[PDB]
Amino acid sequence: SIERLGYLGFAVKDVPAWDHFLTKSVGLMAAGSAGDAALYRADQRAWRIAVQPGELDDLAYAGLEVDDAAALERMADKLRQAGVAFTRGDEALMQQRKVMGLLCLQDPFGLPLEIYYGPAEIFHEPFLPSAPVSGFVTGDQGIGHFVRCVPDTAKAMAFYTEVLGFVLSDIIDIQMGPETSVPAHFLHCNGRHHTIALAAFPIPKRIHHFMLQANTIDDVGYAFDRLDAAGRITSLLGRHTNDQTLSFYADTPSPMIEVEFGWGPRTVDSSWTVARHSRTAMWGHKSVR
Amino acid sequence: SIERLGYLGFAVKDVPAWDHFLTKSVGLMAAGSAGDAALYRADQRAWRIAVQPGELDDLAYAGLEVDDAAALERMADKLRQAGVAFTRGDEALMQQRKVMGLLCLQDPFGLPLEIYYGPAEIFHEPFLPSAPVSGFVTGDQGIGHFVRCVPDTAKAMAFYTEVLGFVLSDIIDIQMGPETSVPAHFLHCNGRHHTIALAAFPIPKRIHHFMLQANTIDDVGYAFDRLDAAGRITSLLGRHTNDQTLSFYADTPSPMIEVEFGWGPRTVDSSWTVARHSRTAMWGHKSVR
Amino acid sequence: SIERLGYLGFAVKDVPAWDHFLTKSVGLMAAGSAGDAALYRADQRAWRIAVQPGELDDLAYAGLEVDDAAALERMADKLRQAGVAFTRGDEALMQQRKVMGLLCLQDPFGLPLEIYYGPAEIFHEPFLPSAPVSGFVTGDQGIGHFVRCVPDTAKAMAFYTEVLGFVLSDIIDIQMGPETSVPAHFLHCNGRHHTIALAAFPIPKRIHHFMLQANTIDDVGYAFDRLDAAGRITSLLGRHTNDQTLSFYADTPSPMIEVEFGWGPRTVDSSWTVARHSRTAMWGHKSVR
Amino acid sequence: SIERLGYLGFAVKDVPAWDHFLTKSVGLMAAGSAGDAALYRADQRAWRIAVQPGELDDLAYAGLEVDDAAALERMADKLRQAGVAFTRGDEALMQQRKVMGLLCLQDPFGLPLEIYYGPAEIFHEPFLPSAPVSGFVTGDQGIGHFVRCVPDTAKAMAFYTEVLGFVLSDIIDIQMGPETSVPAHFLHCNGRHHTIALAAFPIPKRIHHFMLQANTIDDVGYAFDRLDAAGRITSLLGRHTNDQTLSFYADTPSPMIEVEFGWGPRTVDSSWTVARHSRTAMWGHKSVR
Amino acid sequence: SIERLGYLGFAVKDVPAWDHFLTKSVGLMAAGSAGDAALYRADQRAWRIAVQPGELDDLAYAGLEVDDAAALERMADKLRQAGVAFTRGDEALMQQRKVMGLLCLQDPFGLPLEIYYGPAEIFHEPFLPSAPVSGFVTGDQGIGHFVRCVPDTAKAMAFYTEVLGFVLSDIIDIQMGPETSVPAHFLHCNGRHHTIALAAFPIPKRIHHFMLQANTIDDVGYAFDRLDAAGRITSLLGRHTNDQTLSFYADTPSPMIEVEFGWGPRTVDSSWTVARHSRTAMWGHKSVR
Amino acid sequence: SIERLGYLGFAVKDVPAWDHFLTKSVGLMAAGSAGDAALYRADQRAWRIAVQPGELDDLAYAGLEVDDAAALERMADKLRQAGVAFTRGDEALMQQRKVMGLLCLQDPFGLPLEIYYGPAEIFHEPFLPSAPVSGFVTGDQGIGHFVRCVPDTAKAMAFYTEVLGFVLSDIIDIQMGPETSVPAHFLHCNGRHHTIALAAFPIPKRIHHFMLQANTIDDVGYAFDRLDAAGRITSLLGRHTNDQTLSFYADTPSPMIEVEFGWGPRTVDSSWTVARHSRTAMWGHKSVR
Amino acid sequence: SIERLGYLGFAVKDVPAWDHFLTKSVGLMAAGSAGDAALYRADQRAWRIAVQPGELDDLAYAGLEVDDAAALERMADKLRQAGVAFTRGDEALMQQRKVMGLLCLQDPFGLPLEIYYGPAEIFHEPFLPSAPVSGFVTGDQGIGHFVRCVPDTAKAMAFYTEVLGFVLSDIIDIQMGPETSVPAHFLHCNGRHHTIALAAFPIPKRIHHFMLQANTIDDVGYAFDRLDAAGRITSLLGRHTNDQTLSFYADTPSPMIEVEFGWGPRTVDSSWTVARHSRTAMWGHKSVR
Ligand SMILES: [Fe+3]
Ligand SMILES: [Fe+3]
Ligand SMILES: [Fe+3]
Ligand SMILES: [Fe+3]
Ligand SMILES: [Fe+3]
Ligand SMILES: [Fe+3]
Ligand SMILES: [Fe+3]
């Protein structure tokens, strides 16, 4: 039912650091502000990522997109049936988010979620990257993906698949030591191999990282050098086993939250079949202190 | 309902002969062992063919793949309704087969079948053939196909189509003498013209042969020379009438069980129409003593 | 429900004339006989057109193909419900027609129809034309089409669409004089613009003509010269308004029954929309005495 | 050296007949006049065919195009060396023809030829056909071709190949009776199989016909019906043996001069090899009284 | 011999106006400075356009590129033979221009020209436009083109074609009033229809305008709005008759010098043929006060 | 200089055997006769292979094609300079061979060669195979190739390359026993890897075999079965190391002369580089008694 | 004149280390031995890289390939004219190298060079990598490239371009410190951006490294992990500025000699233009201790 991940809002301790990070390093286009939130663009949408001041230094909310008004009412019906509490966004919130309608709720573990429809687009103000990146792969696959940390993956799974409609792509057992392994579950709601992954990681954040997909391999290669100069690289270039995303990781100005910048992943369709992997790295991705 | 044939297990009298056969001749990649079974790879799956010691010198079991956990429960519901006895594989069997879940049963005539989901893949250990073969055509069409010998084709047909969901592609009347003919039934469960064929052959084996599809015609041409040097050729190159597979046959180290190595067959789809053929050979396939 | 027109049987006064006509002129491949009927091939099917001796000098029967055994039973259920009388072909008829099963019936006006499934194919005996023609367009679209003459087009239409499942493509008002016009109805049951057309023509035959589609335009150009030398041309080259078939017409050895040899027609699909035309000729098709 | 045939001028007894013929039937666009010559367009050139009053009722002149000023001087040098008399067109003639420079001469048998360069184009006045024709194939291959009647083909051949640079494509022996045959020589100077053909025909005209190439087969089919309604058809549709032009012929208002309207011919290149044909018709082209 | 136009240097009265113009409006990337000249990029070259202070408010020089050192010596030999005065650029000039070698000269009417080879590229500093433009079409066709004003077009033509190796593409008679027309000559030295055009215009500048080619039509559409907001539009969108460039014109901060921003022109090759046009506009290009 | 191998003439002891062989088995089209020679077609040429009665039971002559009359005179000049004796074919021979001109000579070891130009084509009589073969690959590459047996390969090489213009493709050392090897030299004169190969084989024939190239792999597969039924197979299917021709060999009715029927070889071009191979078989080609 | 780099021979202190390195790490196929040299394959050539015992621990020789025997004689003529000493390889050397002919010489600074023609190929023994690599890009571009260290780049340049025929692609100034830079010259002799580069590096080896090009990016990614496990990585993944090769570097068992494993470089052609770069890295290539 949820069609794609449309936007993300972060609450951070260092807004100037995040602004420079998202523009100069990542390459997003600065798009003014909405309230005390600075807006950033990656394409034709009026905004894709919002950054506001806050002690959380974590993801503040995530916008889940449906294709129309009826679809949003159908989501409200699903929440209602599942017994999930939610509130309809008032006019002010609709204006602030620039959407035609939205339902505000939370996943089982505190992450505020906003199901919305009718987002604002500004084709008369063509996207202009702040750094050398040819463009981002969004469109029907949404803004990208993120790894949601959860204390109970089974509980999280039930909510995301059963209530929100996400579908399991595959699982990767992430070695967390000699005799410790965490089964990460990758979920899709469209062509993107996964829009949200659930993992029971021993981390104090709502998410482990968010990912943006660039158009070319050079986009990623150039990006790595930009973030290396910032001294934020956390991983060498690599390619994932399940989605085949070729990428590198880097720290955001928010401690323990990373960003993944990749290219050329595999996409999913109806014929997709669930599989299991023992490693997240097909090759590369060597961790960097 | 069954999506594709994912794996095969053989119980044989000469394991060293089978190991050399599958690697040096066929070109499969040796992939360690699981219990007393030696594993072999043809692609990204952790294993595709298993070979263990046994007096049977025949196919020990066949793995039938579904796309997810729900699908496996739906298969269990079908078996239940059809009155087909089955057992859920315990943790140890799941570990041994490297699958997330599986149901163990038998076809009407003793062939152990395992319906499973969530197989293991190892992209961090890229497939490397043991002999010059560019690659195998698997993917959604599974590992290949095999001809199941049955005492009663009508009984077998009812089980495979009605209970397992296979669909009849076509029939070939195989001349078994001047006034003797056996109607072989070809069944598909995906794009592969046929994944399983049923034939009432006067042979003491569970199957007449199994087939692997290579990527190029040269793969087959080279393979024929490799198996000819082993003195195992049972047929000259040829092309089948129904699936248009261009191939040759050869003996495996297990008496009366052959292998077919082919290329470029026709694939099936929704618009497929059942037809009848009087010969299995479009051309070639001359039998070789 | 009927999938395509698979074969035609003619009962004629001059078999040697028809044999020469179909082979030397049309280019079909002579394929032996079945009973007192001479068989002719246009592709991989064991036969497509049968010609037997008879005073009728008309179409004796038409084979309507379905994709499988279940589909044939579903047709039997439709006939039953519609109150249409039919008989299951006995073993001998199945053998004679080389089909796995068939129902024998008649359209509202006497044309014997045979709904069948599982036709015989002989890929080991590759099609070889008897005259220079590169090949025929058959496959899923069947053998071609024919215009069925009927005394009551509304009655015929109800039977073919409501009972057999054909779908109206379009209508062409065929000027039959200064103040006389006959509305020809074109029906499809697959990709071929039309497999059967109904027209209330003042002709003593069951059909006005049958059509075969060649692979290239040169096939048609060469064919016209072949039939012109036979002195059988009834129309100059032309292109139809509705299906866009580029063709010419010629007399068969059976008085008042013609053959149409064409190329490159338009095909239909789900999005097709019913339309009306005042002429059958987009250009050409000038009638020739 | 001559690059392509760029234009033709006719001197005719019935200008109104020729105007209607070229526009309503052929489909050329009326483009005003130059002196007492009515101009017609087939593409971006200011004019392609000119028609002026005259008792000749034949081709008055032909424009042979070179790519630049230097090239024209090189042609003048060739004529000079070959001893061929010619005159440089004065300013008035350059203006009348709308060319930057031109040499006026005659072939060995009286046909006035004008070698020119720098023709006028009017892209701001897009070509608009006077009849339903999708467009003409001109460009680098020039306006089309024509068959030049000559009393001595060997003498004509020497001049056109040796002096003007045309190259022999092939020869077709045109049966002119039981024991009479005329060897027609086809010459090219670019991609068009032939731009000029020489034949010793017993006809009182400078040319037997001129040819225009349309973009689609329907263009030709529609054109045939248009000229048939005018009662000018001289040949049924057909396809030539040497250039593979699919076309039909028709009479122009000038007695004994025809027009050929075709499509899809074969083109020539460096690897072309001279061949001989016994017929001009691959198929069709049946002569019509 | 000259391979393409590689760079342009302007001497202007308002550098800050030119900097804003080239970046914010045109979209070029600011690339530091060289001496008192501000550098701008359009691709991988270290610089493409230089702007320095000066009363000229005109083009200061133009860089003509050859492919190697030998080629530059061959140009020196040509100048020498033609009696054209030139000087070899010293080390300092080579450093300032970032080229491996260069000859400094002037065209017959005072425009300083620099023939060079071995330009500097900086792929490690990816091009980043200063305004929304997807990219520019440069590569082998050079930076673009410009219209050189000359008092004597015949004298200019002799120098550019005979000494520098440019080739005439075509001519357009530009109506300069009721009975006044100026024949503009378009010259190419590569795939670009024209790199330099000569016209005897009554203007006090060395050039009438310079042109840049963008990758998409939207690039041009967006650019027009950007320059319209600057109030610099001199022409509405249009398409040229000869090169088929779809573009609009605008004033640069230098009085009487314009810029042309276009897309999708036709390219030239060996088979190109010289032609003449009476208008520069195929459509559009309406002049704007 | 020689452009391609255009035709072959055989002198044989059993003409009826050769006629059946070439038509029923190979698939060539019977094309009447010329003198006491029966003609056979493979495409649009009036004939490609001629068979006449004779005790030789070998190749009687080979036609080497040039593109025009001038080219033939240039060949005559080459023969003259090389001191090679030759005679111009009289009118009768030109008529018999259906060529516009030809020079008759012999290679250094007795094989009569005819260099010709202007061959006859009959597009009005479309090629119709006598057996199921989709078509042959001829065109610019000629009819195919043949292996010429010579007592002195160096002497043969000098003549074919130096006098006739053939170019060495590569060499294959053909093992003729434990310590015996024959270096076969492959020569091309166009795109066909080789048109003529020279080998010092201990065989009493002028040639070891001739080769024809079919359009599809099935053409070859079907052909093998046809020749196997004739009991003429001399080799199993295989693929050559140098030209990559996939084929099989068979005996012609002429003792010690074979035919090769293949598909999909590699073609040569200017960038081709001479190489050496130790085997003729990439795979297959197992000799059959 | 030299067509491509065909092979390399190394003289090393640790042959077992080199054997494991080239097979297990790089992925080359072990191909027996020739004398005391172990041979390795990368494609259809009998060998591409040879490794023999020696204190040099450097490149022992390089094979430069020409297309034929005449071409080799033309090279001998060039050496002769240039006054370069050389010796014709005797039969034994020809046998050892498996070439049809070769000239032995040295570049100006001691690197033994062997110009050869007619190399041996073994298509009957299909290439089989020793490690997971899909294949190498060789063919007309040869085996790859290498950086030749020279004390005098101008002297080296004169020899390689003037005597051997290599052509300068571009130059990269390699920063060798704060005020130290070495101008590396890249030379091509075919489509490969460069086959040999000259640089005045302060290194005691004949070459700095040799490069092999793989078919896919994953080939490189997998290769990096293989060499990292060997602890031989000297550089992180990166992409070069001039040839756009995406690669990583690693140490060979020979101290101070590295290997480069890359993918997807740009290729050169006639239109190539010499340029200059200040960095070798477009991105990545961070040096690793
Ligand atoms: Fe991720
Ligand atoms: Fe099989
Ligand atoms: Fe019809
Ligand atoms: Fe014509
Ligand atoms: Fe312009
Ligand atoms: Fe051969
Ligand atoms: Fe390198």
- Cβ <8 Å between A275 and B123: no
G82 and G13 inside one domain: yes
- Residue numbers in D near F119 (CB within 8 A): 275-276
- For residue A289, give how far its alpha carbon lies from the nearest alpha carbon of chain E (Å): 25
Region for A242 from its dihedrals, namely left if φ exceeds 0, alpha if ψ lies in -120 to 50, beta otherwise: alpha
Between residues 216 and 245 of chain F, which touch chain G (CB distance below 8 Å)? 241
Residues in the annotated binding site of F for Fe cation: 145, 209, 260
Strand partners, A112: A106
- One DSSP character per residue, F123-174 reads TTS----SSS---B--GGG-S-EEEEE-S-HHHHHIIIIIIT--EEEEEEEE
**E32 and E65 assigned to the same domain:** yes
One DSSP character per residue, B244-257 reads --EEEEEE-SSTT-
Q: Looking at the structure, do residues F45 and F166 belong to the same domain, yes or no?
A: no
Residues of E annotated as binding site? 145, 209, 260
Q: How far is the alpha carbon of A220 from chain B, nearest alpha carbon, in Å?
A: 21
Tokens linked to G28? 């080359």
Number of CB pairs, chain C paired with chain D, less than 8 A apart = 41
* E96 and E145 belong to one structural domain: no
Q: How many angstroms away from the CA of B194 is the closest CA of chain F?
A: 21
E-assigned strand segments in chain A = 4-12, 29-34, 37-41, 49-53, 58-65, 87-88, 101-106, 112-117, 145-149, 167-175, 181-188, 196-199, 207-213, 238-240, 246-251, 258-263, 275-277, 281-284
Of B6, B188, B144, B68, the C-alpha closest to A270 is B68
- G232 closest CA partner among G202, G201, G259: G259
Residue whose C-alpha is closest to residue A252's, from A206, A283, A199, A217: A206
Give the residue from chain G lying closest to B225, CA to CA.
G124
Residue A272 forms contact with B (CB below 8 Å): yes
Bridge partners (DSSP) listed for residue G276: E120, G171
Residues of B in contact with A273 (CB under 8 A): 3, 65, 67-68, 140
Residue E174's DSSP bridge partners are: E182
Q: What are phi and psi for residue E59, nearest 5 degrees?
A: -75, 125
Give kind and range of the element (H or E) at residue G40.
strand G37-41
CA-wise closest residue to B5 among B140, B96, B135, B162: B140
Q: Which amino acid is at G178?
A: P
Amino acid letter at E104? C
SS3 C169: strand
Give the closest of C127, C128, C132 to F126, CB-based: C132
CA of A266 to the centre of ligand 1 (A): 13
Q: How far is the CA of F271 from the centre of ligand 7 (A)?
A: 25
What count of other Cβ atoms lies within 10 Å of the Cβ of residue F200? 18
| Among chain E residues, CA nearest to G282 | E124
The DSSP annotation for A215-232 comes to SSHHHHHHHHHHHHHTT-
Closest CA to D281 of F124, C229, F120: F124
B283 CA to centre of ligand 2 in angstroms: 15
Q: How many helices (H) and strands (E) does chain E have?
A: 5, 19
Question: Which SS3 state, helix, strand or coil, does residue A11 take?
Answer: strand
Distance between D246 CA and the closest CA of chain E, angstroms? 27
Which string of b and e fits D58-74 if b means at least 16 CB within 10 Å?
Answer: bbbbbbbbbbbeebbee
Using the 3D structure, point to which of F106, F132, F158 is the last residue of a domain. Answer: F132
Touching, C vs B (3+ Cβ pairs under 8 A): yes
Q: Mutation test of the interface with chain F: which of G4, G100, G117, G121, choosing the one with the most F Cβ atoms within 10 A?
A: G121
The angstrom resolution of this structure is 2.0
Q: Looking at chain D, which subunits does it touch, using at least 3 CB pairs closer than 8 Å as the criterion?
A: C, E, F
Contact C68 B168 (CB under 8 A): yes
**How many other CB atoms are there within 10 angstroms of residue A98's CB atom?**
18
Q: Ligand 1 centre from A268 Cα, in Å?
A: 15
> D187 and D54, same structural domain?
no
Å from D14 to nearest chain E CA?
32
Record the tokens describing residue F146, joined without a space: 């043949």
Nearest-by-CA chain C residue for F27: C128
Comparing C-alpha atoms, which of D98, D95, D104, D96 is closest to residue D72?
Answer: D104
Pairing mode, strands E120-121 and G275-277: parallel
HEC readout, A87-98: EECCHHHHHHHC
Q: Say which residue the tokens 């006049």 belong to.
A: D33
Residues in the annotated binding site of F? 145, 209, 260
Experimental approach taken: X-ray
Put simply, whether G36 touches A (Cβ < 8 Å) is: no
Strand (E) or helix (H) holding E184: strand E181-188
Task: Please tell me whether residues C114 and C155 are part of one structural domain.
Answer: no
Q: How far, in Å, CA of D111 to CA of D103, rounded?
A: 14
Considering the domain architecture, whether residues G142 and G99 belong to the same structural domain is answered as: no
**Residue whose structure tokens are 């690959």:** F137
Q: Pick the residue of F74, F121, F267 with the most D CBs within 10 A to test the interface with D by mutation.
A: F121
Q: Which residues contact A61 (CB under 8 A, 6 or more apart)?
A: A8, A9, A111, A112, A113, A114
Which structural domain range is residue G104 located in? 1-132
Reference B197, options B235, B169, B234; nearest CA is B169
- Return the residue of D nearest to E273 by Cα: D67
Give CA D91 to chain center in angstroms.
Answer: 26
Sign of the Cα torsion D83, D89, D94, D96 reads negative
The residue with tokens 């890289």 is G49
- Dihedral of CA C154/C157/C158/C159: which sign? positive
Calculate how far, in angstroms, residue E194's C-alpha sits from the geometric centre of ligand 5: 8
> How many domains does chain G divide into?
2
Is there a binding annotation on residue C91?
Answer: no
Instruction: Output the CA D47–ligand 6 centroid distance in Å.
Output: 57
Alpha carbons B222 and B237: distance in angstroms, whole number: 12
* C121 shares contact with chain B (CB less than 8 Å): yes
Q: Give me the amino acid identity at C177.
A: G
Amino acid, res. A119:
P
Radius of gyration of chain A from Cα atoms? 18
Give alpha helix (H) positions in C1-114.
15-20, 69-82, 91-97
Measured between beta carbons, which residues in chain G are less than 8 angstroms from residue F278? Answer: 120, 122, 124
Judge D/G contact: 3 or more CB pairs < 8 A. Answer: no
Instruction: Mark whether F205 and F195 lie in a shared domain.
Output: yes
Which of F272, F278, F283 lies nearest to residue G122, judging by beta carbons?
F278
B208 is in an annotated binding site: no
B124 contacts A283? CB cut-off 8 A: yes
- State whether C128 and C86 are in the same domain: yes
Phi/psi region, residue B32 (left: phi>0; alpha: psi -120 to 50; beta: rest), is: left
The number of the ligand nearest the C-alpha atom of G209 reads 7
Domain end call among G132, G156, G191: G132
Strand extents, DSSP E, chain C: 4-12, 29-34, 37-41, 49-53, 58-65, 87-88, 101-106, 112-117, 120-121, 145-149, 167-175, 181-188, 196-199, 207-213, 238-240, 246-251, 258-263, 275-277, 281-284
Tokens representing residue A26 in the block: 């990542």
CB of F269 within 8 Å of a chain D CB? The answer is no
**Token pair 């006809």 is at which residue?**
D203
**Hey, which chains touch E, using 3+ CB pairs under 8 Å?**
A, D, G
Q: Which ligand is nearest to the CA of G193?
A: 7
Residues at the binding site of G are: 145, 209, 260
Query: Contact C5/C187 with Cβ under 8 angstroms?
Result: no
E127 plus E205 within the same structural domain:
no
Residue A24 sits in a domain of what CATH number? 3.10.180.10
D9, D20, D7: which is closest to D253 by C-alpha?
D20
Pairing verdict, β F246-251 and F258-263:
antiparallel
Q: How many Å lie between the alpha carbon of E279 and the closest alpha carbon of chain D?
A: 7
Interchain CB distance below 8 Å, B131 and G128: yes
Whole-angstrom distance, CA of residue E210 vs CA of residue E5? 11
Q: Within this chain, do residues D160 and D145 fall inside the same structural domain, yes or no?
A: yes
Instruction: Please name the amino acid found at residue A103.
Output: L
Q: Which phi and psi angles does G80 have, rounded to 5°?
A: -55, -50
- In the structure, ligand 1 is a single-atom ion and the residues with CB under 5 Å from it are A 211, 260
- Distance of alpha carbon D4 from alpha carbon C272, whole angstroms: 46
The verdict on E10 and E32 lying in the same domain is yes
Nearest C-alpha in A relative to G264: A217
Contact between residue A238 and residue A247 where contact means Cβ atoms under 8 Å apart: yes
Q: What single-letter amino acid sits at B189?
A: C
What residues of chain C lie within 8 A of the CB of F131, using their CB? 128
Residues of A in contact with G217 (CB under 8 A): 217, 246
